[PDB]
Amino acid sequence: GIVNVPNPNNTKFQELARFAIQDYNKKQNAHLEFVENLNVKEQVVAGIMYYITLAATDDAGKKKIYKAKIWVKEWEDFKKVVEFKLV
Numbered sequence: 001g002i003v004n005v006p007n008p009n010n011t012k013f014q015e016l017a018r019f020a021i022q023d024y025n026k027k028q029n030a031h032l033e034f035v036e037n038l039n040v041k042e043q044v045v046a047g048i049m050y051y052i053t054l055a056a057t058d059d060a061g062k063k064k065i066y067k068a069k070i071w072v073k074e075w076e077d078f079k080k081v082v083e084f085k086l087v
Contacts, residue, residue, distance in 0.1 A: 002042065003041065016072070016079065017034065017054045019070070019079055019081070020068040021034055032058065032064075033056055033057040034056055036054070037053070037055070038054060038055055039053040040052050046071070047075075049070070050068075052069075053065065053067050054066055065086065065087045066084060066086045067083075067087060069083045
């Protein structure tokens with residue numbers, strides 16, 4: 001039941017992404033730049049598990065592509081980064 005979400009770049013998805021990156025920053029002690037979502041998949045877990053291939057940056061335009069799993073319960077504003085890693 002992994003459904004591709006059709007507008008992977010929309011505002012919500014990107015708020016997710018920005019959350020994941022915020023949490024990484026404050027986790028592994030380092031600020032990366034948000035650039036934007038490459039893909040966004042959906043699965044009904046206890047709420048909804050979102051698996052995002054997203055893109056960020058080092059120095060000026062020194063890019064890199066990460067992946068994040070985030071567990072959301074939007075009917076609670078609850079969101080939790082379950083994993084994040086650069087490819």
